[PDB]
């Protein structure tokens, strides 16, 4: 689908068997998500941004299906105040930006 | 243009006079620059991403040029660590999100 950026471009997506909303990034380079269950073995890892550094927890491989579209990558997860899709999902779902 | 998303999507903006590069951000709601010299009088504004909040200064019917395409809208400046263009100028361009 085509997205204007009138309002936030969020979107509907499941991961670890739950639904969730989550924002279309493009200024993310990584995925980040709220504090939620998810299977695997993570590394500990910081991320920065505009407020300063959270720390994270780094899953890589997980499966996300971002609007329909599956994607598999690196999700982070900790205290970010939304659920973030970043470029690196972004790019699997073929999303560009257009002007 | 189309922009692809393997790389950060960055652009030359003309802001004040000064030539900048920014972050075309579908995440971010508001245009925030780092600390730089604009013309005018101003507000306190605070705003909150990933690592908590920043403290900005609002500028109102600020003139920015995003890859030559010309914008007029609310322009925050503070310790932002990149320069982001928010949805509140995206719109004006045209820009949208596809997949
Ligand atoms: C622009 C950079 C600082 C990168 N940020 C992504 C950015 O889109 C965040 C993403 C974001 C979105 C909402 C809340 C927090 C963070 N937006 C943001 O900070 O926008 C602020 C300016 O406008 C306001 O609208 C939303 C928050 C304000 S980030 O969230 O910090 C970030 C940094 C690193 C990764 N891997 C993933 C995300």
């Given at each position: 689908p085509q997205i204007t950026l009138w309002?936030?471009?969020?979107?509907?997506?499941?991961?670890?068997?739950?639904?969730?909303?989550?924002?279309?990034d493009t200024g993310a380079d990584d995925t980040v998500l709220e504090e939620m269950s998810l299977p695997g073995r993570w590394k500990p890892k910081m991320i920065?941004?505009?407020?300063?550094?959270?720390?994270?927890?780094?899953?890589?491989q997980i499966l996300i299906?971002?609007?329909?579209?599956?994607?598999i990558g690196t999700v982070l997860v900790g205290p970010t105040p939304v659920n973030i899709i970043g470029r690196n999902l972004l790019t699997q779902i073929g999303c560009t930006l257009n002007f």
């Open positions: 309002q936030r471009p969020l979107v509907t997506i499941k991961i670890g068997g739950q639904l969730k909303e989550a924002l279309l920065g941004g505009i407020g300063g550094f959270i720390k994270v927890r780094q899953y890589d299906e971002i609007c329909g579209h599956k994607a």
